[PDB]
């Protein structure tokens, strides 16, 4: 069977700016075993979770990261916001599934979990499935920064600082995005 467990059950998830991709190949996938086993979000575009078990694809990608609850809505075709624009962008014609669950009991800490970051500053929007891991000081003026933070010179990433007492819109959510591409078709339902 396809190794979804390694994705969904990873101990640690990536920061959304540095989102992880697992390329799935040459295996059989029960996507109905997923679509009940427990998820606050399970939205499919251009496919149904039921119909996936009688379909074959060249490859499947499993993208995974953490964002805050109120940002899960940006993980959909046609959205704008700091997450869709600067961190993780789905194409308008997306074919796949967005799956999310509250991870407050795994990813929040007393005093703040500062390990999860997002890109706040960027001069232009990401292309679909673009990953920007630049740490370059953001030049907000005409004066070059020369790697030093100061006036008009900003670290481009910010921390969520997840705390267990946060309201649910500010709690961490683990997200997995399944993308299906159509060479010989190597990933099939049973």
């Amino acid at each position, epitope marked *: 069977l396809c190794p979804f467990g390694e994705v969904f059950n990873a101990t640690r998830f990536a920061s959304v700016y540095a989102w992880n991709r697992k390329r799935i190949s040459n295996c059989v996938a029960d996507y109905s075993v997923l679509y009940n086993s427990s998820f606050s979000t399970f939205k499919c575009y251009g496919v149904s979770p039921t119909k996936l078990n009688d379909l074959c694809f060249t490859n499947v990608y499993a993208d995974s990261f953490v964002i805050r609850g109120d940002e899960v809505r940006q993980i959909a075709p046609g959205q704008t916001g700091k997450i869709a*624009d600067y961190n993780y962008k789905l194409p308008d014609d997306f074919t796949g599934c967005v799956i999310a669950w509250n991870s407050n009991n795994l990813d929040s800490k007393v005093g703040g979990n500062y390990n999860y970051l997002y890109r706040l500053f960027r*001069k232009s929007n990401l292309k679909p499935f673009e990953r920007d891991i630049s740490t370059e000081i953001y030049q907000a*003026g005409s004066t070059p920064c020369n790697g030093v933070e100061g006036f008009n010179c900003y670290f481009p990433l910010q921390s969520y600082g997840f705390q267990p007492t946060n309201g649910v819109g500010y709690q961490p959510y683990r997200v997995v995005v399944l993308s299906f591409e159509l060479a010989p078709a190597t990933v099939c339902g049973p």
Partner: antibody
Amino acid sequence: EVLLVESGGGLIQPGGSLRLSCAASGFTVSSNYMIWVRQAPGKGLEWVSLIYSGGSTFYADSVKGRFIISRDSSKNTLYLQMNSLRAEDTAVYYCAREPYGDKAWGQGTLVTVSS
Amino acid sequence: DIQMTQSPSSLSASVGDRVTITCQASQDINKYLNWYQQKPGKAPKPLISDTSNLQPGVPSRFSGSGAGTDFTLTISSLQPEDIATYYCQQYDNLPITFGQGTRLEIKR
């Protein structure tokens, strides 16, 4: 030192169009988050519009479909295009480098919507 | 929309008094709350960002605290130059929304 200077405000009839300009010095408009905020005479502050570092735009429901926020990098200027103006749009309009970066507010330009 | 309610709407205090202005959000905004000072006949000036961070050129007699739905601006030693309307603002959840403002008068 950062300067923001709004202009373009004045008397306009209901249904008319105005363009406000906010000329910036000391930072690059096209690289920054900026907003328009308004204040009706003797009232509080109301958010109008937002443009992201990368150009995504957001609007208050009361101005959606009427107002357009934009910027011209060659002139280092932020705009607010205001169409189908109503008496309740009457206000001092402020531009600001907000909500991210070194914060700065302009001095405001007065828009009076009246026949 | 997140409604912001400040308390009180006006106050009058003596020179040297410790003044408290509160701001309640109708839902959680975490730390993402700003304070502004608007002096008679000026534009709003940033005073505090993200609950407690002092802006450039604001004396340390100003401070901010709170979290979630409940926030406080404290002026520790009121001076006549502090005559102003103070506004809270939540910015991290669109639409950006402001409190209705607190008018501050100084006694003599």
